[PDB]
Structures are given as C-alpha cells and as structure tokens.
C-alpha cells in the first residue's frame, strides 16, 4: 500500500456508516413490529423486512403499480410474512405497512439521507442467497445458453436498479444473458435500435457491453467483446460470439467481485450490542464480516425432516458468496466439510404461504468458521476468426492443475492483520454438480 491509506480509511468509514444505518433501521423496525429478541434474530423475519424496504424504494415498479393497480393489492402498501412465537409454537401473520412509512423510517435511520448504497447491500445479500440456493437452468436454456455454465451466474437475480456495486458483483454469465436477451428482442422486432427508444437501448447496450469488457481478463476476449459491441444492429453472429465468450470464461475466468453482505439481523444485533461501525470502520472483503459472524447468533425456521447443519452451511455460503467456490477450500476455511447441493436435505430459506406453521421449528444457525480469508475480485492465472482461434489456443494451453494465488493463504481469526497465512494442502469440488 501507500499514501492511499487515507482513501482506504474514508471508504471504511463510509461503509461502516451504511452498516450502522442498516442495523439501526432494523432495530427501529423491530420496535415498530413488536418482535422479541428471538423473533428479531429470525432470518425469515429479516428477509421480510429487507424485502419491504427494497419494495418501498422501487420507483419504477411503484409508478407502474400506481398507474395500473393490481387485483386487491393497493399500490401504496408493502408487507410480508412475520413469524411470531407464541406458547412455544410458531405462527405466521401477514403484515401491511404504508410505503411512505417505510421510506420515512429508512431515511430517519440514515440521518435523513436516501443511502441507496445500503439498499444495494441488502439486494446483494438477497442475490447471494438466491445464487447459493436455486439454479436458474431454465433461464439458461430459454436464452439458448448451455445449462453447464452455472458457475458464471453470479448475481443473476440482481435487479437493474442496483448501481455500480451490482454490476461489479454480477458475473460474466449474467452479462451474457442480458446481452443475449437484448439481441433476441432486437431479432424479434426490427423497430428495435431505431427511434427515440433506439437511442436509449443503444446506450444501455453500449454500457453493459463496456462493463462486460472491463470484467474480462485476457486481451483476446476484451477485443472480441469490443467487436461484438461495434455492430449497429447485431444478429445471430453476435449472439454466437457472446456464447463463445461465455464458454471461454469457464477456463479464462473473468474478474468478478465477491462481497460478504450479511443479513440485516446481524447488523441490528451488532448495533444493539453497541458496536460503532462508523468509528471502527468496515470492509466487505476483510476480516470484519468473518469476525462479526463469529460473535452473532441467528435463528432460522426448520421444515419437518430437515437438517439444521445443511441449512446453516447454505446460509454461510450465501453470506460469503461461496456458492460457486471450490468445495475443498470452502470446507478448509469453515472447518466443517461442505456438502454439495445435491446432498443438502434442505429447501429454500424463505417459507411459502401454503405451508403449515405448526410442524415447523426453529434451529440456531452455526455461522462460525475455523479460519478466515480475504475475498478476491480476481480470476486466476489467465496468462473475428483470429480472435476465436487465439482464445481456443489459450484455453487448450490451460490445464486444471495450474496453481493460482501463489503464496496467498488463509488466516486465523486471531490474526486480524493477516500477518501469517496458512497455505492449504489438498474429494468433490463442485457445488452444483
């Protein structure tokens, strides 16, 4: 590092203040919903609260709902399931809040500031949970992409309203999906790329293709994506080139940011415990999330005949965005063997409406890791016919044995300054296999 330490501390202060805003907003909403400590630590209650906040600030959807009211749902109220424990058993109740009220509470929590960064953080946490839980092979096959490249679908469920953080965290496969959807839309109707809407669509196409270009690593991919962007009315050839680019990302990996976006319950508990994230600072890639997870208790609803350990592992991988990570390193860091998706005896965290909340129980989630490591936004050792041939040569030269991140290991929770790394010595390796 260098004199950029001051810049590195201002960013820490800003992210700490956003975490403080999230936590104290959760505290205020828990007080306004009359939830006890146990219910306030429920992951489903936190998910519902977060979804209500995100729905309250959705400008486009709210405007459309206002202009086209839904069936029996007024466009000025939000809500979701609230799980409250009475006489030992759980019970769900649908709550309804005015969206102006939710926006006012959120603004008051952040000292009268909009703070869209906090909303983006909550959305990224939701996207990480969805990526760690569900496979969207249906959207892959519908768009023509191979369902085998599910490892490139990082941040696929993120809405467009996410800012630069959403673009940074979303993977190459999702960018290819968005571009291919635009290609198909232009193929269906030729009035696309033409007129006043043509300008806006071309601008959006330009911008998404530019940031996909910035996402790649090697020069050949970075030039083929530029060739794809240059075509004014792209057709099947550009779609095929994008397919090839996505396929090449499995070996020539692209740089995708990974951040530890925790559920709002953890931040609320930390703020209630007296932690000042504004003073101490925060970092989504450092020890700060791992340390916070170590000292926090979070409860979750367990469906009948389900394993709490599997659900805790799922929630942990969602928290650390380790859905597509190598299983060996995930198990090494966590200290408990991480079971692939096929052998997880658990369904999604969110509980459907058509469920009987009388055979359901709550289990404490073990969000503890034996070691901690720094999350990276980098790929690995990545060292129109001409570009395709060059890329094929590069992929053929690569092997699944080259060692990447040489000299970088895993640290202990006591090693806050990352002084002494532990290089692992190395079973299954794919989660979604």
């Amino acid at each position: 590092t260098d004199g950029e330490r001051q810049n590195a501390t201002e960013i820490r202060a800003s992210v700490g203040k956003m975490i403080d805003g999230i936590g104290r907003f959760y505290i205020q909403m828990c007080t306004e919903l009359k939830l006890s400590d146990y219910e306030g630590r429920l992951i489903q209650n936190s998910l519902t609260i977060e979804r209500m906040v995100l729905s309250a600030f959705d400008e486009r959807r709210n405007k459309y709902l206002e202009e086209h009211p839904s069936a029996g749902k007024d466009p000025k109220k939000t809500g979701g399931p609230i799980y409250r424990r009475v006489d030992g058993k759980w019970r769900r109740e649908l709550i309804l809040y005015d969206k102006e009220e939710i926006r006012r509470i959120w603004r008051q929590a952040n000292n009268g500031d909009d703070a869209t960064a906090g909303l983006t953080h909550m959305m990224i946490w939701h996207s990480n949970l969805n990526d760690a839980t569900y496979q969207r092979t249906r959207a892959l096959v519908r768009t023509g992409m191979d369902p085998r490249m599910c490892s490139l679908m990082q941040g696929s469920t993120l809405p467009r309203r996410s800012g630069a953080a959403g673009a940074a965290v979303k993977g190459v496969g999702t960018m290819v999906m968005e571009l291919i959807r635009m290609i198909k839309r232009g193929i269906n109707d030729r009035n696309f790329w033409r007129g006043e809407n043509g300008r806006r669509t071309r601008i959006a196409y330009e911008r998404m293709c530019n940031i996909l270009k910035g996402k790649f690593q090697t020069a050949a991919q970075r030039t083929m994506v530029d060739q794809v962007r240059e075509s004014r009315n792209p057709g099947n050839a550009e779609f095929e080139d994008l397919i090839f680019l996505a396929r090449s990302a499995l070996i020539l990996r692209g740089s995708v940011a990974h951040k530890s976006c925790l559920p709002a319950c953890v931040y609320g508990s930390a703020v209630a415990s007296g932690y000042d994230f504004e003073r101490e600072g925060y970092s989504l890639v450092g020890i700060d999330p791992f340390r916070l997870l170590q000292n926090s208790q979070v409860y979750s609803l367990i469906r009948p005949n389900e394993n709490p350990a599997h659900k805790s592992q799922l929630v942990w991988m969602a928290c650390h965005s380790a859905a597509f990570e190598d299983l060996r390193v995930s198990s090494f860091i966590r200290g408990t063997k991480v079971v692939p998706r096929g052998k997880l005896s658990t369904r999604g965290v969110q509980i459907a409406s058509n469920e009987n909340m009388e055979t359901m129980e709550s289990s404490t989630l073990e969000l503890r890791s034996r070691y901690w490591a720094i999350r990276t936004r980098s790929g690995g050792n990545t060292n129109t016919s001409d570009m395709r041939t060059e890329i094929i040569r590069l992929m053929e030269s690569a092997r699944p044995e080259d060692v990447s991140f040489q000299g970088r290991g895993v640290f202990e929770l006591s090693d806050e300054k990352a002084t002494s790394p532990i290089v692992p010595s190395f079973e299954g390796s794919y989660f979604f296999g």
Partner: peptide, 28 residues
Amino acid sequence: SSGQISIQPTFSVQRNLPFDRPTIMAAF
C-alpha cells in the same frame, strides 16, 4: 447430465481452480 463445470474463486487462497477439461474442450 448437466451440472457445474468450472469454479469461480471467491476466496484469495492458493488453489488450482479445477475445471472439467474434456467436456469444455469437446465443444470445439
């Protein structure tokens, strides 16, 4: 049967980044 074929390295840890080479290169 389809499934995950590559690995995306979220953690900065000395690794080998596995991928299923015969199936990926079979497409060309």
